[PDB]
């Protein structure tokens, strides 16, 4: 039951406002992951929604 959250493994500085900038340890709920290897995510730190690179996050066990 419930959801799986994801955590940033590394800092990332976005180059476009479509993408989130984030810091190691930030957590996200994934809004959509069905379109490719960048995923639409909702940061629990900033409340923002934007694309994140899937190789920079891992599921929180």
């Amino acid at each position: 039951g419930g959801v799986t959250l994801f955590v940033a493994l590394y800092d990332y500085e976005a180059r476009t406002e479509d993408d989130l900038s984030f810091h190691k340890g930030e957590k996200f709920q994934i809004v959509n992951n069905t379109e490719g290897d960048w995923w639409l995510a909702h940061s629990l730190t900033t409340g923002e929604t934007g694309y994140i690179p899937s190789n920079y996050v891992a599921p929180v066990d």
Partner: peptide, 12 residues
């Protein structure tokens, strides 16, 4: 490519 399908950044 759509936003989801752009190349990924290299790992640090």
């Amino acid at each position: 490519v759509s936003l989801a399908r752009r190349p990924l950044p290299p790992l640090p």
